[PDB]
Amino acid sequence: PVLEATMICIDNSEWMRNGDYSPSRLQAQTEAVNLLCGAKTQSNPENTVGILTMAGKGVRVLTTPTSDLGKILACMHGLDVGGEINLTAAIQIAQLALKHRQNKNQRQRIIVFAGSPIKYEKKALEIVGKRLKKNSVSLDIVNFGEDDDEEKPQKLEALLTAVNNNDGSHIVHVPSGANALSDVLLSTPVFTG
Amino acid sequence: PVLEATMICIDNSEWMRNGDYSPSRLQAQTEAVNLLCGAKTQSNPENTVGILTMAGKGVRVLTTPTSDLGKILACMHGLDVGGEINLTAAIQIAQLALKHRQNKNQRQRIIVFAGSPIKYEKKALEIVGKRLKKNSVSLDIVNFGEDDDEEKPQKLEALLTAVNNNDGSHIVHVPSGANALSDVLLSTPVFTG
Amino acid sequence: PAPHEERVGDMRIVNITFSDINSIKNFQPFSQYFDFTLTGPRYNGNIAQFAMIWKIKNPPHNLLGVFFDNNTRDDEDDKYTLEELKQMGNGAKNMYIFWQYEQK
Amino acid sequence: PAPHEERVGDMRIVNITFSDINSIKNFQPFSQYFDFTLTGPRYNGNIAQFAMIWKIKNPPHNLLGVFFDNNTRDDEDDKYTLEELKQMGNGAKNMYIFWQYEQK
Known part of the structure; x- marks a missing residue:
């Protein structure tokens, strides 16, 4: 259905070492x-998926959006881990990759896995959100990580509110539990569209 | 020990699936x-080791002789298996790969792992062996594998006799037993010179 | 930090690790090739539905399966090790090797 | 058939598989980097005799050890998985990954 270029922003911060x-x-x-790369690439053969990491030794685009699922998935092996996510730099870069997409018919979506504290001012995040909304970028936020920052879901909801357009943007708050992160997301619009 | 370029001729024939x-x-x-690659490169830092496979779909040089131990050992992952060895092509190609990489004053050595039936006439092998000798190529033969080729050890011995110059060439007959192929060879001149 | 790549010739080798093979049930497109009733990691001789049936020989304990994303290859149980399978893409552009995360 | 290659950037990843760990004792020079008194696969934080001492985190059951052939990297137990260590060459030209063949 939805024809989409998706840039998935991966949290590879130090917080990700947490068991x-x-x-x-x-x-x-x-x-x-x-799973998301699989679901996105298979929902539509012209969907493209890119991946960047938000933390580590700095934001790094593993692949710009591509339909090449093997190339995408090969990016997920041997991630570096450290530091803190640079959510704003990641969203910025993800936006650029999406604006640069070859098939302009594509809708643009950033998926953010926020598995670590959101150290940016909420207002700064609603700004980002509105910028993305202006630039017609949908955002899915996977909010996970029991790091005890209570502002995070609200900050990310505020990011969500600002960017959301025509219910194209979504936030899923996934605490750890009996269900794997992926299993919780499978029933959400992050996966169902 | 001395300065030596070695081309190891790997048996990747169908017979090598035998347990x-x-x-x-x-x-x-x-x-x-x-282990041999380790031994040869650590015997002399200017030693080079190359590896070819003798069977499969045809003799394949995995690496021409290099002192790059990482490159050499990386050749031993993901071997294809099949076919029957082309021992004469292997020795010919090993000689080529040897001559390709030969550095000044490097003795040349071929190591043949003969893990499968030797479908050559004794005389033909002797002629090959005599040619190795003329080209100053030493040969180590590792004869292993019980495949009811009763003539195999004597044919390989005849090859070794034809090539052998100043006892630089050796044959090891390795039965299957408690002693792993490698532990048998470790005590032999293939490893000790 | 640099790109990891594993490959044999033109074929990318894509290592994917799951803590539970059952997660792959939700992994498009791969799920369609898995028969989740099978014991022992399998590889596919082709990209028919449910093709991952051929027992990989002496698999690593954490190997879940191998999916080659195209073309066909010899189809035998307990013959081809994972390493040998890496030579058996036969034109496949991707060899997906599914691995089980071993915790502790 | 084509060359197998695993790498991270300029670091070759060299997968070496032995049936028994003790064969690595005769594997020069890697025998000198392993610490065969230790349980569980280790990586080295630097080049030193018996330097492969740092516990790899959640290792595959058949992982035997990781040897980076040059340079130094952070040295901590139970922190770096094998995958993460592939990013930790830090200029090593080769990351040797020693695997145990799983038979029976």
């Missing part, structure tokens, strides 16, 4: 990401 | 070969 999402937030995220 | 050397002749060979 509160078994076996690690990184692994829980990687599986969700892989 | 009589556990877990397979292929794997017993891979371990011996890996």
Whole structure:
């Protein structure tokens, strides 16, 4: 259905080493990401999926959006881990990758896996959100990580509110528990559209 | 020891699937070969080791002789298996790969892992061996694998006699047993010179 | 930080790790090739539905399966190790190797 | 058939598989980097005799060890998975990954 270029922003921050999402937030995220790359690429053969990491040794685009699922998934192996997510830099870069998409018919979507504290002012985030809304970028936020920042879901909801257009943007708040991160997302619009 | 370029001729024939050397002749060979690559490169930092496979779909040079141990050992992962060895092509190609990479004052050595039936006439082998001798190529033969080729050890011995110059060439007859192929070879001149 | 790549010739080798093979049930397109009743990691001889049936020989304990995304290859149980399968893409552009995350 | 290659950037990843760990004892020079008194696969934080001491986190059951052939990297137990360590060459030209063949 939806023809979409999606840029998936991966949290590879130090917070991802945490095993509160078994076996690690990184692994829980990687599986969700892989499934999402699969679901996005298979929902429409002209969908493209790119991946960037938000943290580590700096924001890094693993692949710009591509239909090449093997290339996408190959990016998920051997991620570096450290630092803090640079959510704004990641969204900025993700936006650029999406504006640069070859098939302009594509809708543009950033998926953010926020598995670590959102250290940016809420107002700064609603700004980002409105910027994305102006630039016709939908945003899905996967909010996970029990790091005890209570502002985060609200900050990310505020980011969500600002960017959301025609119900194209979504936030899923996924605490750790009996369900893997990916299993929780499978029933959400992050996966169902 | 001395300065030497070695082309290891790997048996990746169908016969190498046999589990009589556990877990397979292929794997017993891979371990011996890996150890040999280590031994040869650590015997002399200017030693080079190359590897070719003798069967499969045709003789394949995995690497021409290099002192790059990482490059050499990386050749032993993901071997194809099949067919029958082309021992004469292998020795010919090993001589080529040897001559390709030969550095000044490098003795040349071929190591043949003969893990499968030797479908050559004794005289033909002797002629090949005599040619190796003329080109100053030493040969080590690792004869292993019980495949009811009763003439195999004597044919390989005849090859070794034809090539042998100043006892630089050796043959090891390795039965399947408790002693892994590699542990047998470790005590032989293939490893000790 | 640099791109990881594993490949054999033109074929990318894509290592994917799951803590539970059952997660792959939700992994498009791969799920369509998995028969989740099978014991022992399998590879596919072709990209028919449910093609991952051929027992990989002496698999690593954490190997879940191998999916080659195109073309066909020899189809036998307990013959081809994972390493040998890496030579068996036969034109496949991607060899997906599914791995089980081993915790602790 | 084509060359297998695993790498991260300029670091070759060299997968070496042995049936028994003790064969690595005769594997020069890697025998000198392993610490065969240790349980569970280790990586080295630097080049030193018996330097492969740092516990790889959640290792595959058949992982035996990781040897980076040059340079230094952070040295901590139970922190770096094998995958993460592929990013930790830090200029190593080769990351040797020692695997145990899983038979039976």
